[PDB]
């Protein structure tokens, strides 16, 4: 699969917005809930990477956020989540570099006034204590760093749509 180029699939998000009826509390409320969910889920994934290193839990966390980001049209986040799930299942064996993935953006210029590595966190993992499961953990850490970037980009586009910091 290739990551989608557009941060928001407006066909899906417009459909969500169309269900508001009257003020916008339904759709904006789901966006706000998702944002919180994403922060909680990233912290959980990081805790696994730094701690228990449970690939099944990482797969469950990926799959969890995939469903919600997909339902809100946040399709690049959903794609990276699907990669995490598959890495956690040992069903994939690579994850693209950040430069390759940022170059696929449709509004490729959205990456101009921010540090694309700002939210990066490094995986506490010995080498030293390395084994057959190390690649999956290290590629999931790579993927999570991508996910935090995709999340910041989605928040930028959403904040611009809502004319308010979300």
């Amino acid at each position: 699969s290739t990551i989608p180029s557009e941060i928001i699939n407006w066909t899906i998000l417009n459909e969500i917005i169309s269900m508001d009826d009257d003020d916008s509390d339904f759709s904006k409320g789901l966006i706000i809930q998702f944002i919180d969910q994403a922060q909680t889920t990233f912290a959980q994934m990081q805790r696994q990477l730094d701690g228990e290193k449970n690939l099944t839990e990482l797969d469950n966390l990926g799959h969890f956020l995939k469903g919600s980001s997909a339902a809100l049209g946040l399709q690049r986040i959903a794609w990276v989540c699907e990669r995490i799930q598959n890495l956690g299942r040992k069903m994939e064996h690579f994850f693209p570099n950040k430069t390759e993935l940022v170059n696929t953006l449709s509004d490729k210029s959205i990456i101009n006034g921010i540090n694309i590595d700002e939210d990066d966190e490094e995986i506490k993992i010995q080498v030293d204590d390395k084994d057959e499961n190390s690649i999956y953990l290290i590629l999931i850490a790579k993927a999570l760093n991508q996910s935090r970037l995709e999340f910041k980009l989605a928040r930028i586009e959403l904040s611009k749509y809502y004319n308010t910091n979300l």
Partner: protein, 133 residues
């Protein structure tokens, strides 16, 4: 009442989206379960009353008991003869085949769009009456 649907789903955002879609389809009697055990328990309680849920939408990955095991328990241990449709962030043919072979009648992948939900309801949902421009 009239039509009664169970949505089984651990992600609250997804619960809220499908609930709103079903409400828009004129279905107000929607119950929510957060995992496969809770789903079993609810279908189990309604089993006593002597009524089915018209339909169950079943997520696959959930803590405690997943949707495949949930379906197996509901089919095997309980009477259960009414439709169960996978509603899940999956995926590929392995997942679809697994769901059908576990005793699910059909399969929807997220995001579920309103027109496609309409088709599933017409296909599988008992008393459902739908409009309409």
């Amino acid at each position: 009442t009239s039509v009664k649907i169970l949505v089984v789903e651990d992600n609250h955002v997804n619960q809220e989206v499908i609930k709103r879609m079903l409400n828009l389809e004129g279905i107000e009697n929607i119950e929510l379960a957060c995992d496969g055990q809770e789903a079993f328990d609810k279908v189990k309680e309604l089993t006593s009353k002597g009524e089915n849920y018209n339909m169950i939408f079943m997520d696959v990955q959930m803590p405690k008991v997943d949707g495949l095991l949930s379906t197996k328990m509901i089919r095997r241990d309980l009477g259960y003869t009414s439709p169960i449709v996978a509603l899940t962030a999956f995926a590929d043919d392995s997942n679809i085949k697994e769901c059908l072979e576990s005793g699910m009648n059909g399969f929807l992948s997220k995001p579920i769009k309103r027109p496609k939900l309409k088709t599933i309801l017409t296909e599988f949902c008992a008393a459902y009456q739908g409009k309409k421009n």
